[PDB]
Amino acid sequence: SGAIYVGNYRVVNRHLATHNDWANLVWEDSSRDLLVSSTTAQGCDTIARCDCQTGVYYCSSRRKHYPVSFSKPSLIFVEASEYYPARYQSHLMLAVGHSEPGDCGGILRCQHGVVGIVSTGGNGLVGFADVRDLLWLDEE
Numbered sequence: 001s002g003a004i005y006v007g008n009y010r011v012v013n014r015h016l017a018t019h020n021d022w023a024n025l026v027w028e029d030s031s032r033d034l035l036v037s038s039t040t041a042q043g044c045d046t047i048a049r050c051d052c053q054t055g056v057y058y059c060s061s062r063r064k065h066y067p068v069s070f071s072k073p074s075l076i077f078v079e080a081s082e083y084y085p086a087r088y089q090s091h092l093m094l095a096v097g098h099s100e101p102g103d104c105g106g107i108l109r110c111q112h113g114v115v116g117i118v119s120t121g122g123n124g125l126v127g128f129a130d131v132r133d134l135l136w137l138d139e140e
């Protein structure tokens with residue numbers, strides 16, 4: 001579990017969104033595994049606006065932050081899970097690291113701020129849903 005809290009937005013994995021998230025919906029995209037809901041309180045996270053390919057992510061199944069090198073956001077084939085069939089997920093970045101079911105929502109960050117959240121795992125790989133292109137998270 002986990003979310004990004006920027007401005008009056010809460011960014012979560014679409015597959016982990018709550019009823020309150022759907023009842024206060026701003027935007028959602030199944031192909032990216034992302035959903036954004038509105039919040040009453042202002043958040044403290046800042047979004048990175050950069051092309052970094054190195055950063056650090058939080059892994060809840062290890063209680064640890066790990067430095068990683070990650071690929072550029074791309075269209076990657078993801079195997080069937082309890083939440084999605086086998087399909088192409090867009091704006092996904094891969095790295096070598098631990099990610100088991102429950103690690104989704106952990107933040108990946110670089111020197112500029114939040115880059116994205118854990119969205120996929122298994123096989124000694126971890127995939128992150130990028131948020132750096134969502135410029136509207138910085139306004140309204």
Ligand SMILES: NC(=O)[C@H]1CCCN(C(=O)C2(O)CCSCC2)C1
Binds near residue numbers: 084100101
């Ligand atoms: N964004 C997605 O399509 C993910 C939905 C949840 C499940 N996804 C995963 O990668 C695993 O849970 C599969 C079992 S091993 C741990 C990682 C894919």
Ligand SMILES: [Zn+2]
Binds near residue numbers: 049051111112
């Ligand atoms: Zn950066």
